[PDB]
Design an enzyme around this catalytic site. Structure first.
Site, PDB file in Angstrom:
ATOM      1  N   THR A  50       1.614  12.038 -34.628  1.00 26.93           N
ATOM      2  CA  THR A  50       0.288  12.174 -35.214  1.00 26.93           C
ATOM      3  C   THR A  50      -0.669  13.000 -34.355  1.00 26.93           C
ATOM      4  N   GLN A  70      10.845  27.976 -52.224  1.00 27.95           N
ATOM      5  CA  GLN A  70      11.374  26.990 -51.293  1.00 27.95           C
ATOM      6  C   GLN A  70      10.270  26.551 -50.329  1.00 27.95           C
ATOM      7  N   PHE A  72       6.844  26.535 -50.615  1.00 28.17           N
ATOM      8  CA  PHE A  72       5.796  25.728 -51.234  1.00 28.17           C
ATOM      9  C   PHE A  72       6.214  24.292 -51.568  1.00 28.17           C
ATOM     10  N   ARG A  75       4.710  19.970 -48.934  1.00 24.82           N
ATOM     11  CA  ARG A  75       3.533  19.554 -49.654  1.00 24.82           C
ATOM     12  C   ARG A  75       2.413  19.244 -48.701  1.00 24.82           C
ATOM     13  N   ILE A  76       2.746  18.998 -47.438  1.00 23.42           N
ATOM     14  CA  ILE A  76       1.682  18.669 -46.504  1.00 23.42           C
ATOM     15  C   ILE A  76       1.227  19.968 -45.832  1.00 23.42           C
ATOM     16  N   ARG A 142       4.767  39.863 -66.989  1.00 24.68           N
ATOM     17  CA  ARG A 142       5.454  39.728 -65.716  1.00 24.68           C
ATOM     18  C   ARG A 142       6.619  38.753 -65.735  1.00 24.68           C
ATOM     19  N   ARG A 169      14.000  24.497 -42.050  1.00 24.13           N
ATOM     20  CA  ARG A 169      14.175  25.916 -42.407  1.00 24.13           C
ATOM     21  C   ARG A 169      14.696  26.773 -41.271  1.00 24.13           C
TER      22      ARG A 169
HETATM   23  C1  LIG Z   1       4.936   1.305 -32.542  1.00 28.13           C
HETATM   24  C2  LIG Z   1       3.732   2.143 -32.984  1.00 28.13           C
HETATM   25  C3  LIG Z   1       2.519   2.189 -32.046  1.00 28.13           C
HETATM   26  C4  LIG Z   1       1.363   3.059 -32.555  1.00 28.13           C
HETATM   27  N1  LIG Z   1       0.170   3.148 -31.724  1.00 28.13           N
HETATM   28  C5  LIG Z   1      -0.921   3.970 -32.212  1.00 28.13           C
HETATM   29  C6  LIG Z   1      -2.227   4.193 -31.465  1.00 28.13           C
HETATM   30  O1  LIG Z   1      -2.310   3.927 -30.283  1.00 28.13           O
HETATM   31  N2  LIG Z   1      -3.197   4.852 -32.101  1.00 28.13           N
HETATM   32  C7  LIG Z   1      -3.174   5.235 -33.395  1.00 28.13           C
HETATM   33  O2  LIG Z   1      -4.161   5.813 -33.850  1.00 28.13           O
HETATM   34  N3  LIG Z   1      -2.173   4.953 -34.154  1.00 28.13           N
HETATM   35  C8  LIG Z   1      -0.900   4.407 -33.676  1.00 28.13           C
HETATM   36  N4  LIG Z   1       0.245   3.994 -34.519  1.00 28.13           N
HETATM   37  C9  LIG Z   1       0.052   4.518 -35.871  1.00 28.13           C
HETATM   38  C10 LIG Z   1       0.730   5.890 -35.999  1.00 28.13           C
HETATM   39  O3  LIG Z   1       0.035   6.890 -35.237  1.00 28.13           O
HETATM   40  C11 LIG Z   1       0.800   6.335 -37.461  1.00 28.13           C
HETATM   41  O4  LIG Z   1      -0.511   6.620 -37.960  1.00 28.13           O
HETATM   42  C12 LIG Z   1       1.369   5.258 -38.365  1.00 28.13           C
HETATM   43  O5  LIG Z   1       2.499   4.626 -37.742  1.00 28.13           O
HETATM   44  C13 LIG Z   1       1.793   5.861 -39.691  1.00 28.13           C
HETATM   45  O6  LIG Z   1       2.943   6.683 -39.489  1.00 28.13           O
HETATM   46  P1  LIG Z   1       3.224   7.979 -40.399  1.00 28.13           P
HETATM   47  O7  LIG Z   1       2.121   8.972 -40.120  1.00 28.13           O
HETATM   48  O8  LIG Z   1       4.671   8.377 -40.120  1.00 28.13           O
HETATM   49  O9  LIG Z   1       3.075   7.404 -41.910  1.00 28.13           O
HETATM   50  P2  LIG Z   1       2.169   8.069 -43.086  1.00 28.13           P
HETATM   51  O10 LIG Z   1       0.755   8.348 -42.590  1.00 28.13           O
HETATM   52  O11 LIG Z   1       2.442   7.336 -44.422  1.00 28.13           O
HETATM   53  O12 LIG Z   1       2.955   9.474 -43.207  1.00 28.13           O
HETATM   54  C14 LIG Z   1       4.373   9.369 -43.457  1.00 28.13           C
HETATM   55  C15 LIG Z   1       5.086  10.701 -43.283  1.00 28.13           C
HETATM   56  O13 LIG Z   1       4.304  11.692 -43.965  1.00 28.13           O
HETATM   57  C16 LIG Z   1       4.141  12.848 -43.147  1.00 28.13           C
HETATM   58  N5  LIG Z   1       2.692  13.139 -43.126  1.00 28.13           N
HETATM   59  C17 LIG Z   1       1.778  12.479 -43.864  1.00 28.13           C
HETATM   60  N6  LIG Z   1       0.527  12.982 -43.718  1.00 28.13           N
HETATM   61  C18 LIG Z   1       0.641  14.003 -42.855  1.00 28.13           C
HETATM   62  C19 LIG Z   1      -0.261  14.896 -42.302  1.00 28.13           C
HETATM   63  N7  LIG Z   1      -1.579  14.814 -42.654  1.00 28.13           N
HETATM   64  N8  LIG Z   1       0.207  15.849 -41.444  1.00 28.13           N
HETATM   65  C20 LIG Z   1       1.513  15.948 -41.128  1.00 28.13           C
HETATM   66  N9  LIG Z   1       2.450  15.109 -41.625  1.00 28.13           N
HETATM   67  C21 LIG Z   1       2.066  14.120 -42.477  1.00 28.13           C
HETATM   68  C22 LIG Z   1       4.906  12.605 -41.848  1.00 28.13           C
HETATM   69  O14 LIG Z   1       6.167  13.289 -41.962  1.00 28.13           O
HETATM   70  C23 LIG Z   1       5.245  11.130 -41.828  1.00 28.13           C
HETATM   71  O15 LIG Z   1       6.605  10.943 -41.380  1.00 28.13           O
HETATM   72  C24 LIG Z   1       1.277   3.387 -34.037  1.00 28.13           C
HETATM   73  C25 LIG Z   1       2.455   3.146 -34.888  1.00 28.13           C
HETATM   74  C26 LIG Z   1       3.540   2.481 -34.447  1.00 28.13           C
HETATM   75  C27 LIG Z   1       4.679   2.295 -35.405  1.00 28.13           C
HETATM   76  C1  LIG Z   2      18.851  23.195 -46.810  1.00 29.43           C
HETATM   77  C2  LIG Z   2      18.003  22.549 -47.907  1.00 29.43           C
HETATM   78  C3  LIG Z   2      18.566  22.454 -49.341  1.00 29.43           C
HETATM   79  C4  LIG Z   2      17.593  21.789 -50.332  1.00 29.43           C
HETATM   80  N1  LIG Z   2      18.035  21.696 -51.715  1.00 29.43           N
HETATM   81  C5  LIG Z   2      17.148  21.075 -52.655  1.00 29.43           C
HETATM   82  C6  LIG Z   2      17.496  20.868 -54.110  1.00 29.43           C
HETATM   83  O1  LIG Z   2      18.649  20.985 -54.450  1.00 29.43           O
HETATM   84  N2  LIG Z   2      16.514  20.385 -54.905  1.00 29.43           N
HETATM   85  C7  LIG Z   2      15.219  20.205 -54.553  1.00 29.43           C
HETATM   86  O2  LIG Z   2      14.421  19.835 -55.384  1.00 29.43           O
HETATM   87  N3  LIG Z   2      14.804  20.496 -53.393  1.00 29.43           N
HETATM   88  C8  LIG Z   2      15.696  20.851 -52.277  1.00 29.43           C
HETATM   89  N4  LIG Z   2      15.284  21.274 -50.921  1.00 29.43           N
HETATM   90  C9  LIG Z   2      13.860  20.989 -50.772  1.00 29.43           C
HETATM   91  C10 LIG Z   2      13.597  19.749 -49.902  1.00 29.43           C
HETATM   92  O3  LIG Z   2      14.308  18.583 -50.352  1.00 29.43           O
HETATM   93  C11 LIG Z   2      12.096  19.473 -49.885  1.00 29.43           C
HETATM   94  O4  LIG Z   2      11.566  19.733 -51.181  1.00 29.43           O
HETATM   95  C12 LIG Z   2      11.408  20.382 -48.899  1.00 29.43           C
HETATM   96  O5  LIG Z   2      12.270  20.567 -47.777  1.00 29.43           O
HETATM   97  C13 LIG Z   2      10.116  19.750 -48.423  1.00 29.43           C
HETATM   98  O6  LIG Z   2      10.444  18.740 -47.477  1.00 29.43           O
HETATM   99  P1  LIG Z   2       9.451  17.509 -47.205  1.00 29.43           P
HETATM  100  O7  LIG Z   2       9.168  16.721 -48.469  1.00 29.43           O
HETATM  101  O8  LIG Z   2      10.020  16.811 -45.987  1.00 29.43           O
HETATM  102  O9  LIG Z   2       8.127  18.291 -46.729  1.00 29.43           O
HETATM  103  P2  LIG Z   2       6.646  17.981 -47.293  1.00 29.43           P
HETATM  104  O10 LIG Z   2       6.672  17.850 -48.805  1.00 29.43           O
HETATM  105  O11 LIG Z   2       5.690  18.948 -46.574  1.00 29.43           O
HETATM  106  O12 LIG Z   2       6.345  16.545 -46.626  1.00 29.43           O
HETATM  107  C14 LIG Z   2       6.300  16.394 -45.201  1.00 29.43           C
HETATM  108  C15 LIG Z   2       6.694  14.965 -44.842  1.00 29.43           C
HETATM  109  O13 LIG Z   2       5.824  14.007 -45.472  1.00 29.43           O
HETATM  110  C16 LIG Z   2       6.564  12.960 -46.135  1.00 29.43           C
HETATM  111  N5  LIG Z   2       6.171  12.950 -47.572  1.00 29.43           N
HETATM  112  C17 LIG Z   2       5.320  13.846 -48.119  1.00 29.43           C
HETATM  113  N6  LIG Z   2       5.076  13.578 -49.426  1.00 29.43           N
HETATM  114  C18 LIG Z   2       5.776  12.463 -49.722  1.00 29.43           C
HETATM  115  C19 LIG Z   2       5.933  11.683 -50.865  1.00 29.43           C
HETATM  116  N7  LIG Z   2       5.278  12.019 -52.017  1.00 29.43           N
HETATM  117  N8  LIG Z   2       6.728  10.586 -50.796  1.00 29.43           N
HETATM  118  C20 LIG Z   2       7.356  10.226 -49.661  1.00 29.43           C
HETATM  119  N9  LIG Z   2       7.237  10.934 -48.527  1.00 29.43           N
HETATM  120  C21 LIG Z   2       6.484  12.050 -48.496  1.00 29.43           C
HETATM  121  C22 LIG Z   2       8.016  13.156 -45.750  1.00 29.43           C
HETATM  122  O14 LIG Z   2       8.233  12.295 -44.616  1.00 29.43           O
HETATM  123  C23 LIG Z   2       8.075  14.629 -45.340  1.00 29.43           C
HETATM  124  O15 LIG Z   2       8.986  14.895 -44.278  1.00 29.43           O
HETATM  125  C24 LIG Z   2      16.116  21.702 -50.028  1.00 29.43           C
HETATM  126  C25 LIG Z   2      15.675  21.970 -48.637  1.00 29.43           C
HETATM  127  C26 LIG Z   2      16.507  22.451 -47.682  1.00 29.43           C
HETATM  128  C27 LIG Z   2      15.953  22.678 -46.297  1.00 29.43           C
HETATM  129  O1  LIG Z   3      -2.895  29.781 -63.618  1.00 26.18           O
HETATM  130  C1  LIG Z   3      -2.353  29.809 -62.491  1.00 26.18           C
HETATM  131  C2  LIG Z   3      -2.291  30.992 -61.730  1.00 26.18           C
HETATM  132  C3  LIG Z   3      -1.695  30.940 -60.469  1.00 26.18           C
HETATM  133  N1  LIG Z   3      -1.192  29.763 -60.021  1.00 26.18           N
HETATM  134  C4  LIG Z   3      -0.556  29.665 -58.716  1.00 26.18           C
HETATM  135  C5  LIG Z   3       0.932  29.365 -58.894  1.00 26.18           C
HETATM  136  C6  LIG Z   3       1.640  30.400 -58.057  1.00 26.18           C
HETATM  137  O2  LIG Z   3       2.074  29.755 -56.846  1.00 26.18           O
HETATM  138  C7  LIG Z   3       0.567  31.478 -57.806  1.00 26.18           C
HETATM  139  C8  LIG Z   3       0.734  32.725 -58.689  1.00 26.18           C
HETATM  140  O3  LIG Z   3       0.829  32.373 -60.071  1.00 26.18           O
HETATM  141  P1  LIG Z   3       0.807  33.493 -61.221  1.00 26.18           P
HETATM  142  O4  LIG Z   3      -0.639  33.903 -61.352  1.00 26.18           O
HETATM  143  O5  LIG Z   3       1.656  34.572 -60.614  1.00 26.18           O
HETATM  144  O6  LIG Z   3       1.286  32.782 -62.486  1.00 26.18           O
HETATM  145  O7  LIG Z   3      -0.731  30.922 -58.073  1.00 26.18           O
HETATM  146  C9  LIG Z   3      -1.276  28.582 -60.810  1.00 26.18           C
HETATM  147  O8  LIG Z   3      -0.809  27.483 -60.396  1.00 26.18           O
HETATM  148  N2  LIG Z   3      -1.852  28.660 -62.021  1.00 26.18           N
END
Ligand SMILES: Cc1cc2nc3c(=O)[nH]c(=O)nc-3n(C[C@H](O)[C@H](O)[C@H](O)COP(=O)(O)OP(=O)(O)OC[C@H]3O[C@@H](n4cnc5c(N)ncnc54)[C@H](O)[C@@H]3O)c2cc1C
Ligand SMILES: Cc1cc2nc3c(=O)[nH]c(=O)nc-3n(C[C@H](O)[C@H](O)[C@H](O)COP(=O)(O)OP(=O)(O)OC[C@H]3O[C@@H](n4cnc5c(N)ncnc54)[C@H](O)[C@@H]3O)c2cc1C
Ligand SMILES: O=c1ccn([C@H]2C[C@H](O)[C@@H](COP(=O)(O)O)O2)c(=O)[nH]1
Ligand SMILES: Cc1cc2nc3c(=O)[nH]c(=O)nc-3n(C[C@H](O)[C@H](O)[C@H](O)COP(=O)(O)OP(=O)(O)OC[C@H]3O[C@@H](n4cnc5c(N)ncnc54)[C@H](O)[C@@H]3O)c2cc1C
Ligand SMILES: Cc1cc2nc3c(=O)[nH]c(=O)nc-3n(C[C@H](O)[C@H](O)[C@H](O)COP(=O)(O)OP(=O)(O)OC[C@H]3O[C@@H](n4cnc5c(N)ncnc54)[C@H](O)[C@@H]3O)c2cc1C
Ligand SMILES: O=c1ccn([C@H]2C[C@H](O)[C@@H](COP(=O)(O)O)O2)c(=O)[nH]1
Ligand SMILES: O=c1ccn([C@H]2C[C@H](O)[C@@H](COP(=O)(O)O)O2)c(=O)[nH]1
Ligand SMILES: O=c1ccn([C@H]2C[C@H](O)[C@@H](COP(=O)(O)O)O2)c(=O)[nH]1
Lengths: 210, 216, 220, 216
Positions: A50, A70, A72, A75-76, A142, A169
């Site tokens: 964090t 790929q 986009f 999501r974060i 397009r 990636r």
């Molecule tokens: C043993 C332990 C001790 C800890 N001590 C501290 C402390 O001293 N101070 C403190 O403030 N907190 C602390 N925490 C809380 C910790 O910092 C996390 O906020 C908390 O555990 C939630 O974890 P997470 O962010 O993985 O879960 P979530 O906030 O639900 O996020 C889950 C996943 O989503 C992704 N994600 C979500 N939002 C973002 C984002 N905005 N940017 C990037 N990736 C994102 C990450 O991949 C993450 O794995 C502690 C937690 C534990 C388990």
């Molecule tokens: C080699 C490879 C092959 C793949 N093939 C496929 C395919 O066949 N089909 C397909 O659809 N996609 C596929 N992907 C896409 C992949 O599964 C994810 O869509 C993409 O990598 C984004 O990963 P992420 O969700 O960890 O990252 P983000 O969406 O940026 O999220 C970052 C972190 O936050 C947490 N998080 C964020 N949002 C949520 C949520 N809503 N619920 C729970 N946790 C969350 C997770 O811990 C995650 O690691 C492929 C990716 C790779 C690298």
């Molecule tokens: O109406 C729109 C126009 C754009 N986009 C976003 C999606 C694509 O990631 C990018 C380009 O979309 P196009 O305008 O090329 O459809 O902008 C939308 O979501 N809705």
């Protein structure tokens, strides 16, 4: 800071907030290089991720749409892309080099694959132009353009989310084309956060190519 | 830039990436015209195109009572690191309401007595806490006797879009008064770093009732 | 399903969408396939867990009803990828309910005063603080102010809707010895419900993906 | 169980649902320390929450959809980040001969110098030539992830989408709207229709008090 990718792509650093010490400050909650680096390595190895959310980058990226679909999926992060609905779309397409097919034993030379890719691009884009000129709205016209068309986007992403991106990636299971974009992201990341990047590679990085 | 809030709190700006133009460049997708740029800020805000504002980011250092922080950390599109009670020995700092805070409600005792009654238990809870610490009780169990007005400290990193949402909800008379005060301080900093987004926000998008009344 | 936690806490399952097959269904869209086979579907789950394909588990969703001390709620609600709705101390007159650790809570720490004295001192400030809270209310102090004297060990209640991927991140961090004991207990019961509703996903998680320690030692 | 056909070959299919209108009432009611009441009170509450923009309670209603859509539709749709997607992969499967051909009537209101039918024809030809090039590259041993880059944006893809009612209503605001491209509006009409079927009170309330678009 700009890194060219593929034939006509790039990643440029637009802006960055913070540096390695930003993660240090957050983890300590407040506001000696060996103590600070040590904390960075401590957080990385234990999965305290964090504090890295307080270093943030904005990149400007020119990439083929199939790479951008790929990308986009991460999501974060924040995206703004060129609208093809609204911009008359540029004659820019990714044409693979022949080297792209190394290790693949193909029926037709890699050089003819290349030629075949560019011909479709040319016929698709010309049909697209025929459509515009006859008054078909751009948003309709397009739809015939191929997935290798170049697009551009701003991507703002924090270092934690950037590390998850590189885990998925900067790895040889990802399509090669996005790997190359990932390498560039890593290089800018290294430049800006040496200690974070270095600890990332040692303790937490899950991929292979880096 | 640092603003005192409540009796012992503050909002301090640690960092900022971008300014009004960062939203403009992102909407246009161009890396590299005041009237036109401002006109666009207004346009995106008028028509609900809010994504470009996500490319401006703030880091705050925030000191506030836990009951306030629990309302605040409910905003999930943000990054928080908070002082840990499990690991650090906690400071004698507690939010004790002014009598000015209760003047406005009809109470059956002077607000002076509310202040002294609150101060009283804070004092007894804190002492019990220290006795437990000293006697060897781990801090993470010893602190559960501490009341919700204990001050904590957090770093918050949040983009301008999510900050605007925060302001819609917290910069508003429906929000608890204590957090309104923190929102005013967040608004002021926002206004200073992004004056064009701020004014466009107040004009077109802002859903609350205090920022249109109270200057900055 | 309701599991009692601590002296007055609980985790209750309100709702579930989907089950193990939801994830198989979702993963199969990538290869132009639907559901395929009762034992090929299980192996696909192991496979996904083993290679770190977590997205398909997002299609399993739970809603839990949870009663827990505020200090535990505070840690829990840090998990941002989830939906929460909590009992409001601004609008409700809070009930007299507080987590009084049992004497066994202090096993493995030398103390200076006996464990039942520790328990006693906790009870004492809880009874003081709550009397004041009630005196404050009776006097016309609005609830949103009066309650700030209440201690961190006050119980609160919340709905949590959270998908199985995020719930697995929660078990990673909270069903682990580094997390505070009280939330560990809560993470066990969450584990027990995940397991009852998603047995394939859950076994695969423990075997391939789970990073904590206690769920490999502590049954269910 | 629901399935709605969109465009020439696409669809929106409801796969599963968690909860209903009362799921939001229940979640909302926790705040006041209350529960379910009569039909009159509970309907009133949903309307209340929608009027004042208390949307968190709606996050407890969840949907899974299975959607078949051209890439240019799915690319816009996938921008909605608060959702879960799994999609058909052009990296791993042989893609089917399925592309969205606009009907003649899609071009209503635009003076074209080529009868709409010939537009339709021209799009079919280019799509066909692309797909033939794709197949020929695949048959010759070009890796799927590469051969497919010649396929146009009107190629049909498939996805499962899991999305809560709150994020669903945000999707409706933006895509159930004349400013959105016609093709996505049609998918949005399908989404709204199913939303309506499963959460009638919420949907009505959304329509009367919060829905920002013009087509519903
Ligand atoms: C043993 C332990 C001790 C800890 N001590 C501290 C402390 O001293 N101070 C403190 O403030 N907190 C602390 N925490 C809380 C910790 O910092 C996390 O906020 C908390 O555990 C939630 O974890 P997470 O962010 O993985 O879960 P979530 O906030 O639900 O996020 C889950 C996943 O989503 C992704 N994600 C979500 N939002 C973002 C984002 N905005 N940017 C990037 N990736 C994102 C990450 O991949 C993450 O794995 C502690 C937690 C534990 C388990
Ligand atoms: C080699 C490879 C092959 C793949 N093939 C496929 C395919 O066949 N089909 C397909 O659809 N996609 C596929 N992907 C896409 C992949 O599964 C994810 O869509 C993409 O990598 C984004 O990963 P992420 O969700 O960890 O990252 P983000 O969406 O940026 O999220 C970052 C972190 O936050 C947490 N998080 C964020 N949002 C949520 C949520 N809503 N619920 C729970 N946790 C969350 C997770 O811990 C995650 O690691 C492929 C990716 C790779 C690298
Ligand atoms: O109406 C729109 C126009 C754009 N986009 C976003 C999606 C694509 O990631 C990018 C380009 O979309 P196009 O305008 O090329 O459809 O902008 C939308 O979501 N809705
Ligand atoms: C006056 C007032 C009284 C309130 N009383 C209560 C109470 O009694 N009980 C209680 O529990 N809380 C209550 N809150 C907290 C409130 O319910 C919100 O959680 C909090 O205000 C943050 O709202 P948010 O979801 O808009 O912010 P964030 O969590 O920062 O989300 C920001 C934006 O992202 C979107 N979003 C983020 N995550 C999701 C998701 N998972 N699903 C769908 N959309 C998402 C939404 O569009 C949202 O506007 C109260 C808030 C205020 C201001
Ligand atoms: C008619 C129209 C034309 C458009 N043209 C363009 C274009 O030229 N370029 C382009 O890139 N896109 C464009 N789009 C796409 C648009 O910018 C959004 O990406 C898309 O509408 C998703 O909206 P959202 O982010 O509100 O929904 P989601 O991303 O699902 O978010 C839902 C809610 O959660 C909150 N939220 C989620 N993540 C964050 C975050 N990281 N920071 C702050 N708040 C967050 C917001 O409150 C948001 O309303 C267009 C869309 C439409 C409808
Ligand atoms: O094990 C921990 C310790 C801390 N925190 C979070 C919750 C609070 O926002 C802040 C301080 O928690 P305490 O250490 O005071 O419980 O950090 C956790 O989430 N888990
Ligand atoms: O105005 C409010 C009221 C409540 N809550 C949230 C925060 C906690 O999760 C829970 C209880 O808050 P209090 O009513 O106790 O402040 O609801 C807010 O965010 N803002
Ligand atoms: O390596 C991959 C494969 C797929 N996808 C996602 C992106 C698209 O939404 C969908 C299909 O992508 P292709 O296989 O067509 O690239 O799955 C990725 O993100 N990375």
């Amino acid at each position: 800071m700009k890194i060219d990718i593929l034939d006509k792509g790039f990643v440029e650093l637009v802006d960055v907030m913070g540096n390695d010490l930003s993660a240090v400050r957050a983890a300590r909650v407040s506001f000696d290089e060996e103590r600070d680096r040590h904390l960075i390595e401590y957080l990385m190895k234990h999965g305290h991720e964090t504090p890295f959310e307080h270093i943030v980058f904005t990149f400007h990226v020119k990439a083929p749409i199939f790479v951008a679909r790929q990308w986009f999926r991460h999501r974060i992060a924040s995206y703004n892309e060129l609208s093809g609905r609204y911009s008359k779309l540029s004659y820019e397409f990714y044409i693979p080099s022949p080297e792209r097919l190394e290790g693949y034993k193909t029926t037709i030379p890699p050089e003819r694959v290349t030629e075949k890719i560019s011909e479709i691009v040319d016929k698709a884009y010309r049909t697209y132009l025929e459509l515009i000129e006859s008054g078909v709205p751009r948003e309709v016209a397009r739809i015939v353009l191929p997935l290798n068309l170049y697009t551009r986007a701003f991507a703002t992403v924090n270092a934690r989310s950037l590390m998850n991106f590189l885990n998925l990636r900067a790895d040889s299971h990802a399509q090669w084309e996005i790997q190359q974009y990932a390498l560039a992201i890593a290089r800018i990341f290294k430049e800006k956060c040496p200690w974070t990047f270095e600890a990332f590679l040692k303790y937490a990085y899950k991929g292979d190519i880096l």
